[PDB]
Design a protein around this ligand. Structure first.
Ligand SMILES: Cc1cc(N)nc2ccc(N)cc12
Ligand SMILES: Cc1cc(N)nc2ccc(N)cc12
Lengths: 238, 238
């Protein structure tokens, strides 16, 4: 996160850190708790990941320093990548992790509500991007979970800023015209969370951008509401 | 290493990477193989290290990417810190690791000779600093073992550049007047290796500097030849 600040412990209790154990353990991506056995994240996070066995999901984390060999985590039973996904910049940058065990909800770990198709008309004015990602393009993973409040921009405006891309209705963009606050490397898969009528909604999934927090380059996010049917389909038993 | 280049595999076969496993595994410091059971490194590397159980020594490494949960390593049986050590900037920045098992020497892993008291008169003109450390003050650990050729400077000259310090005869300095090449964070404990009469000698141990590779700020190293009696004393059996 560029231009963000340190979060209060547990103020983003749906936020997880997804680690890979290969070759040695490190943060890979963000993700969001959306069900007792389900994390929603970005498909592009799994580039070169050949098995869910190397993945660990940590909930209730503020600082990466909390994670040691003796820290409890959730194993991943299955990675579900959208079948239309090719790469982040083409859209469909969405994936589910089915956990091996179920999350016991508590103040530090609980699910975020999905947006409603009826909220497509809502103007979200209180949106935040969160993660342990870079503070600038060439940087490193941060210890303390960072937060930044970022305004949504229209898809029409976003298309103006990405003339070599097709910014689709399955994407949503957020950023300041002058830049300064944005997701960056390592924030991928985390939430764009918007509070509306006292409820937090998972509006976006951090996906891509040209650089981080540059002027006239909004961050691009997966438009979660366009995938509520897919999420329902994929999270049913057998 | 600032201003360095990628090493050829095994061209520094005495160079080890010392990892800590706490809280999760990461490179901590460099070190040098000097005996079948002995690594020479910097005392300051062990700040807050309460037990040798959390340490792993990896030999024969070029890229950190080689190190996975299944990669062989040497355990540490004992950390021996010089009894006069207080901090890097005051000198005595020297420590031995006694390994749990012995190193089987090969082209990729073998010991470096210690300097002779009779070489105190030698002008070393072919000295190199090596490590996986930062490329600049605020950076991160590098994948490929880096090397930089750096000229020794006189202690008189070094003292000129560090007016708030006492640069002692138990220290040795190296750097360009214009800067640009130097050790940096994460290179600590590694060798300053000088080739003289076709033999590599362990002249220094990377210790400290004000910033990395700054103009008129030579890197400061432990002057290994001043500790050959100590090394002998500490590496004897019971
Ligand atoms: C995830 C992400 C978002 C963004 N807005 N910019 C980025 C730039 C580089 C990168 N590797 C990832 C990025
Ligand atoms: C080990 C080391 C050497 C040097 N020449 N400069 C440094 C600067 C900062 C730091 N943390 C370590 C350094």
């Amino acid at each position: 996160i560029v231009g963000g600040t340190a979060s209060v412990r547990g103020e983003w209790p749906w936020q997880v850190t997804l680690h890979t154990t290969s070759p040695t353990q490190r943060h890979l991506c963000g993700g969001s708790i959306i069900g007792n056995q389900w994390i929603l994240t970005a498909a592009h996070c799994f580039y070169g990941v050949e098995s869910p066995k190397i993945l660990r999901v940590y909930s209730g984390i503020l600082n990466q320093a909390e994670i040691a060999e003796d820290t409890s985590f959730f194993g991943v039973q299955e990675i579900i990548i959208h079948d239309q996904y090719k790469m982040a910049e083409s859209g469909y940058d969405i994936a589910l992790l089915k956990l091996e065990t179920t999350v016991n909800y508590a103040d530090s770990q609980r699910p975020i509500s999905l947006p409603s198709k009826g909220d497509r008309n809502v103007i979200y004015t209180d949106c935040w991007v969160t993660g342990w990602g870079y503070r600038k393009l060439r940087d490193k993973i941060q210890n303390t979970l960072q937060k930044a409040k970022i305004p949504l921009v229209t898809n029409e405006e976003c298309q103006k800023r990405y003339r070599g891309h097709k910014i689709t209705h399955k994407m949503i963009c957020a950023g300041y015209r002058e830049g300064g606050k944005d997701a960056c490397k390592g924030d991928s898969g985390g939430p764009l969370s918007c509070k509306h009528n006292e409820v937090w909604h998972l509006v976006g999934i951090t996906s891509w951008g040209e650089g981080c927090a540059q002027r006239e380059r909004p961050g691009v996010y997966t438009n979660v509401v366009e995938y509520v049917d897919w999420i329902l389909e994929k999270t049913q038993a057998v």
